[PDB]
Amino acid sequence: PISPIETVPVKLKPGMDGPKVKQWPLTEEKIKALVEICTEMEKEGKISKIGPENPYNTPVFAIKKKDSTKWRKLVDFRELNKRTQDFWEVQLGIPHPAGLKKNKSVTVLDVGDAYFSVPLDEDFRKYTAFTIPSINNETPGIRYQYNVLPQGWKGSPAIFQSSMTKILEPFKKQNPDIVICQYMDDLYVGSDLEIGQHRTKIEELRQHLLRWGLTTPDKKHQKEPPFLWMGYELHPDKWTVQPIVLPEKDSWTVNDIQKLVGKLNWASQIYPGIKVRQLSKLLRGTKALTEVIPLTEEAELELAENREILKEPVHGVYYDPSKDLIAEIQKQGQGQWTYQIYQEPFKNLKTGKYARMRGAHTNDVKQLTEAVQKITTESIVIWGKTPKFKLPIQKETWETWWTEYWQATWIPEWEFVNTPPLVKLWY
Amino acid sequence: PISPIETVPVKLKPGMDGPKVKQWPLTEEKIKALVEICTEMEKEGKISKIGPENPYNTPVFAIKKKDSTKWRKLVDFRELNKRTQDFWEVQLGIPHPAGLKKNKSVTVLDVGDAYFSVPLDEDFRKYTAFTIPSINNETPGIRYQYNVLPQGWKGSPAIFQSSMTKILEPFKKQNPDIVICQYMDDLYVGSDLEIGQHRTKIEELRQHLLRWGLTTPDKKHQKEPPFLWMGYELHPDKWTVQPIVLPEKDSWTVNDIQKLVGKLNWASQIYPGIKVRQLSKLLRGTKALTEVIPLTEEAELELAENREILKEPVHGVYYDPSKDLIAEIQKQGQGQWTYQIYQEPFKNLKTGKYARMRGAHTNDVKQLTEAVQKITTESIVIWGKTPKFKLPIQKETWETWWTEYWQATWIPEWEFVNTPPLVKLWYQLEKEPIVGAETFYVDGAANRETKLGKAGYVTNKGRQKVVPLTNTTNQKTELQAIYLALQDSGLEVNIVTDSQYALGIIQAQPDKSESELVNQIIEQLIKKEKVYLAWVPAHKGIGGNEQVDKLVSAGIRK
Numbered sequence: 001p002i003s004p005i006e007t008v009p010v011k012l013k014p015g016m017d018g019p020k021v022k023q024w025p026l027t028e029e030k031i032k033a034l035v036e037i038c039t040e041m042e043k044e045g046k047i048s049k050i051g052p053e054n055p056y057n058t059p060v061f062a063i064k065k066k067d068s069t070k071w072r073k074l075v076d077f078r079e080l081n082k083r084t085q086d087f088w089e090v091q092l093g094i095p096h097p098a099g100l101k102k103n104k105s106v107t108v109l110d111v112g113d114a115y116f117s118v119p120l121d122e123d124f125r126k127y128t129a130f131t132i133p134s135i136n137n138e139t140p141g142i143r144y145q146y147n148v149l150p151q152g153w154k155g156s157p158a159i160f161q162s163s164m165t166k167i168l169e170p171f172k173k174q175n176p177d178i179v180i181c182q183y184m185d186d187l188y189v190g191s192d193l194e195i196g197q198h199r200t201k202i203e204e205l206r207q208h209l210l211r212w213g214l215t216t217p218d219k220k221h222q223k224e225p226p227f228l229w230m231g232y233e234l235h236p237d238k239w240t241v242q243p244i245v246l247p248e249k250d251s252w253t254v255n256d257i258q259k260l261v262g263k264l265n266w267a268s269q270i271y272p273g274i275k276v277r278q279l280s281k282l283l284r285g286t287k288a289l290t291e292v293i294p295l296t297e298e299a300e301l302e303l304a305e306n307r308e309i310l311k312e313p314v315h316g317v318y319y320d321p322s323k324d325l326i327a328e329i330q331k332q333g334q335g336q337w338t339y340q341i342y343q344e345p346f347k348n349l350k351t352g353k354y355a356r357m358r359g360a361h362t363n364d365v366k367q368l369t370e371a372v373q374k375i376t377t378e379s380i381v382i383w384g385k386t387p388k389f390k391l392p393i394q395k396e397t398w399e400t401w402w403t404e405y406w407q408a409t410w411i412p413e414w415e416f417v418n419t420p421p422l423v424k425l426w427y
Numbered sequence: 428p429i430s431p432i433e434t435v436p437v438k439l440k441p442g443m444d445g446p447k448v449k450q451w452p453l454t455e456e457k458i459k460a461l462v463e464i465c466t467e468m469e470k471e472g473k474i475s476k477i478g479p480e481n482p483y484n485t486p487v488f489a490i491k492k493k494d495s496t497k498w499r500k501l502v503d504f505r506e507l508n509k510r511t512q513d514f515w516e517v518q519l520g521i522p523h524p525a526g527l528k529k530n531k532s533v534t535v536l537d538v539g540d541a542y543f544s545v546p547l548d549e550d551f552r553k554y555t556a557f558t559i560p561s562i563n564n565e566t567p568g569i570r571y572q573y574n575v576l577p578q579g580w581k582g583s584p585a586i587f588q589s590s591m592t593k594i595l596e597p598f599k600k601q602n603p604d605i606v607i608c609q610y611m612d613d614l615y616v617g618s619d620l621e622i623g624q625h626r627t628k629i630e631e632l633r634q635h636l637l638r639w640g641l642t643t644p645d646k647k648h649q650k651e652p653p654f655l656w657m658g659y660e661l662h663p664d665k666w667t668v669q670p671i672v673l674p675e676k677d678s679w680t681v682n683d684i685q686k687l688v689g690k691l692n693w694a695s696q697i698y699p700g701i702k703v704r705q706l707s708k709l710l711r712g713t714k715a716l717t718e719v720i721p722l723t724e725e726a727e728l729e730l731a732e733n734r735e736i737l738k739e740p741v742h743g744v745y746y747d748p749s750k751d752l753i754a755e756i757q758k759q760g761q762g763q764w765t766y767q768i769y770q771e772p773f774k775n776l777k778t779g780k781y782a783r784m785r786g787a788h789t790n791d792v793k794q795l796t797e798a799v800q801k802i803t804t805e806s807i808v809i810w811g812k813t814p815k816f817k818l819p820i821q822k823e824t825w826e827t828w829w830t831e832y833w834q835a836t837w838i839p840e841w842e843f844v845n846t847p848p849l850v851k852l853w854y855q856l857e858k859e860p861i862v863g864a865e866t867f868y869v870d871g872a873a874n875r876e877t878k879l880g881k882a883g884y885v886t887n888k889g890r891q892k893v894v895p896l897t898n899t900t901n902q903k904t905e906l907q908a909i910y911l912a913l914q915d916s917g918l919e920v921n922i923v924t925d926s927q928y929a930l931g932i933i934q935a936q937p938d939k940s941e942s943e944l945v946n947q948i949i950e951q952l953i954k955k956e957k958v959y960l961a962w963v964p965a966h967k968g969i970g971g972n973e974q975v976d977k978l979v980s981a982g983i984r985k
């Protein structure tokens with residue numbers, strides 16, 4: 001509900017104590033970044049300094065929300081998040097826009113600003129405590145705590161939630177074709193309009209949100225233009241499924257046949273509809289691997305038709321919303337990275353692919369980081385929930401770099417899976 | 428009337444309550460002793476006459492044996508600081524000297540007493556209460572509570588530094604050019620003024636802390652550098668250590684092994700070359716601290732080498748925020764890696780090592796990255812930025828690897844240093860099947876409940892063979908087969924396995940390993956001019972594989 005210039009009493013879970021998560025050492029430049037940021041936040045009455053009667057502390061990084069001349073503070077309120085939960089007691093009870101993953105254009109506007117206008121309950125403030133590190137331990141660390149709803153805390157949208165609709169209502173009223181579902185910090189405005197127009201509806205909104213006060217910085221490069229490209233205009237309709245496909249041929253060797261058998265024998269864990277023996281006899285006897293063997297008449301069928309058994313999903317179209325959504329990622333060939341997202345082993349709710357080309361996007365880490373943000377953002381669009389990653393990167397390296405090329409304003413949860421030497425075969 | 432400082436509002440855990448561990452008496456002896464001390468204190472501040480009303484008690488027990496002409500007062504807050512809340516941490520990240528700045532002057536002021544100065548939140552005093560043994564059976568006994576930071580309690584290191592920092596504030600203010608970090612009790616005022624004006628400043632400061640009511644050992648001079656700080660020796664253009672008491676003893680129990688490692692593993696940071704892999708393994712196969720861990724062959728050797736570099740105590744420098752950092756790495760031995768970070772040739776700031784307790788099979792390269800890695804994480808904390816790596820490996824050797832490697836990887840740019848030994852590859856596996864290369868279909872199964880099993884092959888050239896083995900593993904054997912193959916095969920050959928396991932070990936093209944066997948294989952693959960290795964479904968009866976499987980112990984011939 002709305003409380004006018006008054007406080008809204010938040011709290012924690014059953015037996016739950018504030019977070020005591022350790023701060024990670026940053027570089028000299030992320031330090032000063034934050035120092036400039038926070039000092040000003042301090043002057044604007046947003047945050048405040050804290051004595052030692054506060055054992056609490058949640059992590060923080062300095063990423064470039066956008067790689068502009070301007071840096072940005074990114075608080076990692078994950079753990080703080082788990083430990084609080086009294087909210088779905090929200091006024092609405094609608095699930096996630098099952099059609100949003102369907103629209104033509106899904107632009108992502110981030111209203112994290114707003115939040116800094118609501119006072120946090122003096123009582124709960126303490127759990128928001130963060131610490132700006134100090135190079136090489138010379139100084140205790142700098143310590144502030146929030147006085148307003150903090151971005152990323154999975155509870156500020158909920159407080160604010162009422163003011164949202166109250167604002168959105170009009171735009172939604174008139175523009176009733178467009179879907180507007182929000183997640184964590186940003187909104188997800190969708191529609192089937194032809195680009196040129198969509199963009200404006202987004203822009204009308206922006207100008208609307210901004211009209212009432214709720215600032216939006218999410219401005220695309222220019223004023224009001226005409227020629228098309230790839231930005232944060234997610235196009236849900238076009239992102240499709242990169243299936244597991246078999247090769248085509250006029251020179252298949254015994255190895256060739258072999259690998260094939262191996263691969264289909266695997267797919268039978270997903271699509272048990274597969275068959276192979278009539279493609280397994282071709283190898284009867286111990287022949288060279290290089291030997292070339294004509295793909296037989298009765299054989300040529302299997303391969304051919306298994307190539308259709310794959311183009312059709314399995315018995316797992318079922319997403320239990322209260323089960324964890326997991327994502328895996330194999331670093332294929334080069335430049336390319338493939339993925340999957342299941343909730344249960346071998347029944348992927350989706351299998352995609354990521355890639356780019358070494359320009360400034362030179363290394364593995366920035367690639368992976370992007371393939372992550374990518375898979376995550378998709379996921380929020382589809383189930384409105386980020387998956388748990390199983391990144392194929394030594395944690396150290398991931399932990400020292402993961403920030404460098406990050407731009408989102410959420411932190412999924414990851415883990416470091418350590419090895420895929422066959423699953424790499426195009427999952 | 429007057430407490431300078433302001434108090435850091437305190438509290439204890441919700442629902443919990445103060446300690447009441449009652450008075451465990453002792454005769455009237457040391458009672459005068461304490462009574463003398465707690466009265467010289469009672470003055471006005473440090474403590475106070477507790478009324479009758481006092482319910483709590485955290486027992487003061489006099490132990491003068493630690494102090495000479497003086498009878499030391501040592502309380503025990505065991506049951507109070509149990510009941511106390513928690514405070515933000517009292518940072519324990521020994522600023523590694525290596526990331527310290529060159530200074531012309533450095534001074535030091537004891538402040539461990541201050542504790543006793545800072546006032547205590549009134550409402551939390553009602554629990555610091557300690558009781559002195561009087562002489563009778565009746566009611567009144569000597570009741571005294573604290574009114575300052577009781578050394579020993581929980582957040583004393585806490586609320587002190589806070590309090591301390593908010594006190595330095597102004598001096599630190601009017602004196603924009605003088606560094607004053609602290610470490611629990613040691614204050615290190617530092618600057619760049621001749622010892623004279625320096626103690627001018629260090630002069631004003633002592634008076635300042637003094638006006639903010641604090642101690643100072645004496646209106647005396649002050650410093651005494653080099654320093655003995657957390658095992659470090661700090662001169663100006665230098666920093667090091669010397670407490671090396673290293674065992675020449677007959678026997679050696681884990682405890683004096685852990686100290687053995689624990690000691691070199693410290694020397695490690697500034698002596699160019701310490702190794703300690705071997706000594707490590709030792710811990711393997713034990714629990715009790717004073718036990719039989721029959722020392723080993725190579726071990727004495729490691730213990731033997733560093734024993735030398737220690738001969739001439741070393742010296743590390745300080746850092747030039749202006750200059751660029753640099754680290755080179757060299758491959759000490761079979762898996763050990765030694766590095767060092769400097770800013771100017773030979774003027775090291777610190778050094779280190781690296782051994783891969785990681786994995787059970789690895790190769791120079793991966794290791795060399797974990798190293799490059801370990802150093803960066805370090806470097807980031809110690810200096811707030813990452814060094815320029817110079818390493819014994821040509822791009823071509825590594826670029827052809829981070830690429831085929833299935834794991835993500837990012838090295839801050841490096842710089843080929845041709846200082847042999849060189850990190851290289853010994854074999855690459857021909858990424859495609861060979862022609863005219865005999866094709867060996869291999870296997871080696873065992874009974875999961877036995878000691879003996881057998882491995883063998885069947886080729887296209889018609890050759891069939893089986894070898895029987897003593898005390899092996901079903902897995903272990905599949906790697907025997909691979910191994911048998913490479914044995915009676917030509918300089919180029921194709922191998923076909925059903926062991927995702929043997930596949931995965933070899934594929935990772937390892938060079939260093941502890942599995943005696945895998946070290947054999949990793950050997951034949953270098954004598955080989957070309958090796959193609961591929962997999963196939965198990966018990967799926969695929970021409971060549973269907974043959975070695977029924978040619979191996981199928982249950983039992985029966």
Ligand SMILES: COc1ccc2c(c1)N(C(=O)OC(C)C)[C@@H](CSC)C(=S)N2
Binds near residue numbers: 607609617
């Ligand atoms: C002669 O010892 C020193 C020489 C140089 C430095 C220090 C001590 N440093 C320090 O606090 O020492 C710690 C390790 C206890 C700090 C601050 S001293 C003002 C600095 S800037 N470099």
Ligand SMILES: [Mn+2]
Binds near residue numbers: 925
């Ligand atoms: Mn087998």
